[PDB]
Amino acid sequence: MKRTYQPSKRKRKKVHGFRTRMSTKNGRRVLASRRRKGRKVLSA
Amino acid sequence: AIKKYKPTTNGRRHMTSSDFAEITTSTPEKSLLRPLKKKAGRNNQGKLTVRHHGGGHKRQYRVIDFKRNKDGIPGRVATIEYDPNRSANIALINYADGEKRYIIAAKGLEVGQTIYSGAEADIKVGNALELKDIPVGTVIHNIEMKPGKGGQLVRSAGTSAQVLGKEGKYVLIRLNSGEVRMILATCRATIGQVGNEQHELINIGKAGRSRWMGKRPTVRGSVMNPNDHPHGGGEGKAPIGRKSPMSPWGKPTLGYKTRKKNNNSDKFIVRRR
Amino acid sequence: MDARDIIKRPVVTEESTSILDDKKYTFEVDTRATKTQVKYAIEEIFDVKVAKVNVMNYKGKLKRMGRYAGYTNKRRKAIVTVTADSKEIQFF
RNA sequence: GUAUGAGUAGCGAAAGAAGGGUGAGAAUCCCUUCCACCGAAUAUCUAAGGUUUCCUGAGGAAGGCUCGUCCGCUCAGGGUUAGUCGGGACCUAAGCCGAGGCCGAUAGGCGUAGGCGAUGGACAACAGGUAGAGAUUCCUGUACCAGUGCUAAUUGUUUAACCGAUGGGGUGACACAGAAGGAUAGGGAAUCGCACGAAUGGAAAUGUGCGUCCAAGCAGUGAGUGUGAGAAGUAGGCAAAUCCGCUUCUUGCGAAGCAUGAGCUGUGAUGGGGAAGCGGAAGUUCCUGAUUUCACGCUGUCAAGAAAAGCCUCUAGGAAGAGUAGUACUGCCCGUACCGCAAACCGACACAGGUAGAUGAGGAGAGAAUCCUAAGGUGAGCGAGAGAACUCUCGUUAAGGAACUCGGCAAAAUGACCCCGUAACUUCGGGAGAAGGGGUGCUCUAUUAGGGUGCAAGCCCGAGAGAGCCGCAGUGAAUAGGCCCAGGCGACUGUUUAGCAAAAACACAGGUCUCUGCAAAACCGUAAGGUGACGUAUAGGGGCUGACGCCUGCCCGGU
RNA sequence: UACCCAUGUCCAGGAUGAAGGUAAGGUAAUACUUACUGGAGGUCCGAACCCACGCACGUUGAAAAGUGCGGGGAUGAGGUGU
Ligand SMILES: [Mg+2]
Ligand SMILES: [Mg+2]
Ligand SMILES: [Mg+2]
Ligand SMILES: [Mg+2]
Ligand SMILES: [Mg+2]
Ligand SMILES: [Mg+2]
Ligand SMILES: [Mg+2]
Ligand SMILES: [Mg+2]
Ligand SMILES: [Mg+2]
Ligand SMILES: [Mg+2]
Ligand SMILES: [Mg+2]
Ligand SMILES: [Mg+2]
Ligand SMILES: [Mg+2]
Ligand SMILES: [Mg+2]
Ligand SMILES: [Mg+2]
Ligand SMILES: [Mg+2]
């Protein structure tokens, strides 16, 4: 059994990172809504 | 020639190949090589637009001279080589300048001959001339369609076209497919037939040999599901239960003509194949 | 850059005191100071002749006091060795 | 929130025993001895990932499938050192972003110059010490790379030493398979050294145990592997070139000369390490020998096998300072603890699962198979005692030998090496390990006959035979094809429903019909822009049939 | 997880003996025969590695698909990392 989550630092920050969010209109929408709800960690 | 293989195994039983007797050297000219990367039919967007491609031996591009616009310099044939990117072989020509370039190997082109291009060239196999200076009846190849652009019409191995007449600003050519066409008189061509005639006699023999050249398997439409192909479905084997056989996207596939009906070059085509 | 603000404080422990007689001195420095700023700062402050500097970066440990989990501060430690013909530093 | 099932199921692959110690308390913690397990791993490194789990002093509420004085748990202090190792200040691939630009109700999509981006290219350090925790980093000894200043001679100064491109050129720079070599690592014997020299019949020597060395750099050498030499002349190498390319002449070669090149010798060594009793003796000769290196070197084949920087050279250019020798000094940022076939990673768990790479010893052996072991590591986080039914995993069974059953399902049987022998049919390759049989142990002739190695000493390899000897049994253990006759389907190797179906289904090489003259047809997209293709009818797309052999008949009214 | 692109890496041992080549024959010259050489293959047997054909167990599992004993491929239409 090879499971579903195989971790990697680079593969995580390149897909879900802050710069990846800020590079798109919809990623900026995601960041805005997470700021609105009041979450401690944005993106990451 | 064509080399038959002994039936040692079941995959070598029906297999044939060329013996590469005409090829002279096995190393390319380094300063004329460019890299190629496979695309497997993937689009600008990354989508698979043309299917059944991808995953063969890697190759490297050899930049060929189709314009043949070096006029008045005698060019001497140096070697005859192998090109993975086309069915015909190629010949390396180094001029009296010191410059070198590749051209398509014509039939009967041997090492040591001299090759000319221009207006004062003789009518011999390998020379390049404008179509107005070529006498009626000769067999030519590498016909270009717009002046200064480069050869484009007859170029694969064993193919040939024949000059057929004059109409002032145009020249009649009978293309390899059997078509009679009008081409400007200032467009160039090369005298002779194209090199490797036996290329069509090769029996591949193996499925892996098709895989080596970059061909993925072809699934028939009759063994698909109804949402995949207009032919899929049915219990057991099923006939073509339609009015006509169909392509994977509709649009009948047997006998249906797909050339544009309002084409701008219908006045330059004298008679179709 | 105002040498007294890139050298923070001496490190006093058994590990540091053991090498203290080798003319090796352990200090706390800014997290941004480089190996050469430290050397010139030491030469400006203590009036010595520095031979080498080694630096290392420490992470912050994770402590708690019940429902309150947090991280200790971030450290940058420098070991400074002086040349043979130079006066020492006290620490005491 | 609390019951019933109920003191019930379970306590997650495995060998432990006793004697001392600690403690309020011991099967479970520490020490000693014996026993047992892995050993192409359950050993040693090292990426990813984890993120303090590392070390020391205290602790026993909760966690640990039991106990605990213990712990990867709780508390408090500590612990990670680089010019040379891996990554930046060096280079580029796939891909991504993209000034102007093209396209588009808005939003935006595409894309040129340019730039990011290793899984690849280039690049200067080795051997020991380190008793709580780091080591090519600290320390000791000996080095190398780039640069700077200070001294001392040398040379050159605008018919101009010297430097030299963001430009040209060469190299860098490359697939797969096969075979024969050189060398070294490793392994094994003698020799040499130190110690022991003995409990139960024998042995003071043909006895027993352990060891039997050492870098980078510097100076030499070198198995080899590639390899034309000189001189003229220039429609080309965006300008120029003394460099490259092209042509013509002279001179001829497994001979030298040039490049590379494993390894070896001296120094480094007045140093370091090393068996026993803080010191430290000996470190020679021979045999075997790589999956490593020379080296993608050679040969062969077709499916025809990255880019840029770096390095060298050429001019365009810059030029009054320049190298030389000796000395001292300068060299930034990030990672460095610990686990890493695992109790620290992915699986909710201290989970019988999954996890890239380097090294990976001996006997017998073709072998990384197989059994037993070395270095090294472990005894598996519930026990003891009885030896019922039944269930699971194993071992033997008299006579019969498929009578069982949907069906020889399961099990039993064959199994290594050497020799003899072998059918129908065939697409002439096969069928074929067809079938069916025979021989294997130990002693003597015997350091054989003969081979490999060496100058010799010697060492290694080991067929035939004869005579014998012993067992129920001689590949005496483990590991190691059951075979034959006839038919259906598919030609064959391959692929398929992750988790009920592996097949007669899909694919395939081959056949045929049809579309396409190049801004090709076909396909993605509103378009721009693309694939097709850096291709050109011997090419590209679609439908059906599916190796090979013999063949493929009649109907054009309907669609 | 499916297909693709760029760049790396892995596959103990043993068996068979295609093309071609050399020599001796045989010819007017060839064809052809015999020995030696040679090292082909979606070749053969078989570990690592990949897979999942049969049976048994498990089935409030050690495991939300596994284990044990046999089984198929193992130089390629191969396995695998980033
Ligand atoms: Mg197709
Ligand atoms: Mg098909
Ligand atoms: Mg179907
Ligand atoms: Mg439909
Ligand atoms: Mg249908
Ligand atoms: Mg059907
Ligand atoms: Mg039917
Ligand atoms: Mg550091
Ligand atoms: Mg009960
Ligand atoms: Mg019980
Ligand atoms: Mg247990
Ligand atoms: Mg005890
Ligand atoms: Mg054992
Ligand atoms: Mg084993
Ligand atoms: Mg890490
Ligand atoms: Mg974790």
Ligand SMILES: [Mg+2]
């Ligand atoms: Mg903690």
Ligand SMILES: [Mg+2]
């Ligand atoms: Mg600990």
Ligand SMILES: [Mg+2]
């Ligand atoms: Mg307790």
Ligand SMILES: [Mg+2]
């Ligand atoms: Mg407890």
Ligand SMILES: [Mg+2]
């Ligand atoms: Mg702890």
Ligand SMILES: [Mg+2]
């Ligand atoms: Mg150092």
Ligand SMILES: [Mg+2]
């Ligand atoms: Mg570095």
Ligand SMILES: [Mg+2]
């Ligand atoms: Mg580096």
Ligand SMILES: [Mg+2]
């Ligand atoms: Mg713009």
Ligand SMILES: [Mg+2]
């Ligand atoms: Mg873009």
Ligand SMILES: [Mg+2]
């Ligand atoms: Mg670019």
Ligand SMILES: [Mg+2]
């Ligand atoms: Mg980069």
Ligand SMILES: [Mg+2]
């Ligand atoms: Mg890298």
Ligand SMILES: [Mg+2]
């Ligand atoms: Mg280096």
Ligand SMILES: [Mg+2]
């Ligand atoms: Mg440690």
Ligand SMILES: [Mg+2]
């Ligand atoms: Mg060390």
